[PDB]
């Protein structure tokens, strides 16, 4: 029932609101924080070293109303680097709580 065009429009607005935050949000307490970023799926804020960072499931998802308590996660290492998957230069991410159904 949810169309591609409606989802694309919602995603563009999510990206725009995210870009506003990336530019406007105050600087991190220290350089040891992992840097905020938009990874095409979710908008990530700066991360405290050695901690998990969570954001709600992206609101543009067609099934967003079905995962309102969900969160997507990343891990900011003690050295201030987003944990990376051994597979590549991509960050480890846990999106399981935002999957359909």
């Amino acid at each position: 029932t949810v169309s591609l065009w409606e989802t694309v429009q919602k995603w563009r607005e999510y990206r725009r609101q995210c870009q506003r935050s990336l530019t406007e949000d105050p600087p991190p307490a220290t350089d040891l924080f992992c840097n905020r970023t938009f990874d095409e799926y979710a908008c990530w804020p700066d991360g405290e070293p050695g901690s998990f960072v969570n954001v709600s499931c992206p609101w543009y998802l067609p099934w967003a109303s079905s995962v309102p308590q969900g969160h997507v996660y990343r891990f900011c290492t003690a050295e201030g680097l987003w944990l990376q998957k051994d597979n590549s230069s991509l960050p480890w991410r846990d999106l399981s709580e935002c999957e359909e159904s």
Partner: peptide, 26 residues
């Protein structure tokens, strides 16, 4: 899930889902 409109609706719903899968993996 037995009528032509069930398949058509399913097909239409897949475009949005493929878009998401593309954002996730890419």
């Amino acid at each position: 899930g037995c009528f032509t409109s069930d398949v058509s609706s399913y097909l239409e719903g897949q475009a949005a889902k493929e878009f998401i899968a593309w954002l996730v993996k890419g």
